[PDB]
């Protein structure tokens, strides 16, 4: 049976179109755009940075400009021609180093770099993750299976305004001579969020429970 949510979704959408707030085409166009989103472009940006010091500097200073190199123009790629309404146009790339490791969260909600990374994980939106990460990052990351030297600076980035972040982790050992494709393959969504680090041989996010939807896409 249809849920109260599905009933209301149809009601809202039909009314909006009926009143000319947005067109049926607009809705299809947006869903199509969302369908093309994913973590691949962000992974390529990291791989490219690892292989090009000049490009890495660009990523760190001007994320928006750097993003164009992986086919994601924050201003013109979305259907609006002025960036997505919710993700805005100010991507910043956080570069990890032997003395610094970043992890991102949006304590106020779920702000995520959608244009270049795709949709946010269910857990990323949880009150739990939003409450704890900023205060107990060492403990939260450990839960994810990630631990760093005590002297290393763990920096939590709270995306609370118009900036969105992606993490550029340090290139892992054991990837000598690897091609861009090989390097991008190990930069998973979780690595770009900061709850995991790239590892040779690991090409998918760590397996975790999956809650099934009543009626999935």
Partner 1 sequence: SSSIREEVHRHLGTVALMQPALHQQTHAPAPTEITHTLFRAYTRVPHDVGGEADVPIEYHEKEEEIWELNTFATCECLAWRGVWTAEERRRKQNCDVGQTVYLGMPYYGRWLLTAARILVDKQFVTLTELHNKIVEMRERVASGQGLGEYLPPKAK
Partner 2 sequence: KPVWDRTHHAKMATGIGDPQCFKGMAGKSKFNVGDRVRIKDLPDLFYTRTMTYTRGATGTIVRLVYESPAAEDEAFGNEENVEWFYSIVFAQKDLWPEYSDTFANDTLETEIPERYLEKA
Residue 109 is given by DSSP the state S
Q: Which one of 59, 110, 159, 191 is the catalytic residue?
A: 110
| Annotation says 106 is catalytic | yes
Give dist(CA 202, CA 109) in Å, integer: 30
Give dist(CA 126, CA 110) in Å, integer: 8
CA nearest to 91, candidates 80, 104, 101 = 104
| Annotation says 89 is catalytic | no
- Cα 101 to the center of its chain, rounded Å: 16
Nearer to partner 1, 57 or 135 (CB): 135
Binding-site member from 23, 80, 97, 128 for partner 2 (CB under 8 A): 80
| Annotation says 109 is catalytic | yes
Mention every residue, 6+ apart, whose C-beta is less than 8 A from residue 117. 37, 38, 39, 41, 42, 166, 189, 192
Give dist(CA 72, CA 39) in Å, integer: 11
Binding-site member from 110, 117, 191, 193 for Co ion (CB under 5 A): 110
Residue 161 is given by DSSP the state S
Give dist(CA 72, CA 77) in Å, integer: 6
x-or-dash string of contact with partner 1, 177-206, rule CB under 8 A: ------------------------------
Contacted by 26, from partner 1, Co ion, partner 2, none: CB < 5 to 8 Å by type:
partner 1
Nearer to partner 1, 65 or 136 (CB): 136
Give dist(CA 159, CA 164) in Å, integer: 6
Which parts of 9-28 interact with partner 2 (CB under 8 A)? 21
**Residue 53 beta carbon to partner 2: minimum distance, rounded to whole angstroms:** 21
Binding residues (CB under 8 A) for partner 2: these are 8, 21, 74-76, 80-83, 85, 88-90, 92, 99, 107-108, 134-135, 137-138, 142-147, 150-163
Binding residues (CB under 8 A) for partner 1: these are 1-16, 19, 21-22, 26-27, 30-31, 34, 79-80, 84-86, 88, 107-110, 119, 121-123, 125-132, 134-136, 139, 143-144, 158, 208-217
């Amino acid at each position: 049976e249809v849920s109260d949510f599905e009933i209301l979704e149809m009601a809202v959408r039909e009314l909006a179109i009926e009143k000319g707030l947005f067109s049926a085409e607009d809705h299809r166009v947006w869903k199509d755009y969302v369908h093309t989103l994913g973590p691949l472009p962000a992974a390529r940006l990291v791989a490219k940075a690892w292989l090009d010091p000049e490009y890495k500097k660009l990523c760190i200073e001007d994320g928006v400009e750097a993003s164009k190199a992986v086919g994601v123009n924050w201003v013109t790629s979305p259907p609006t021609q002025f960036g997505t309404p919710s993700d805005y146009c100010n991507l910043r790339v956080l570069a990890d180093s032997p003395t610094l490791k970043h992890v991102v969260v949006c304590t106020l909600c779920s702000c995520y770099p959608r244009p270049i990374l795709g949709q946010s994980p269910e857990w990323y939106r949880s009150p739990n993750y939003r409450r704890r990460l900023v205060r107990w990052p060492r403990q939260v990351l450990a839960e994810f299976g990630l631990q760093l030297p005590s002297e290393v600076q763990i920096r939590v980035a709270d995306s609370n305004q118009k900036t969105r972040y992606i993490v550029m982790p340090v290139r892992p050992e054991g990837t000598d001579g690897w091609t861009e494709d090989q390097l991008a393959e190990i930069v998973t969504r979780d690595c770009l969020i900061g709850v995991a680090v790239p590892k040779p041989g690991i090409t998918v996010n760590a397996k975790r429970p999956v809650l099934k939807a009543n009626r999935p896409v």
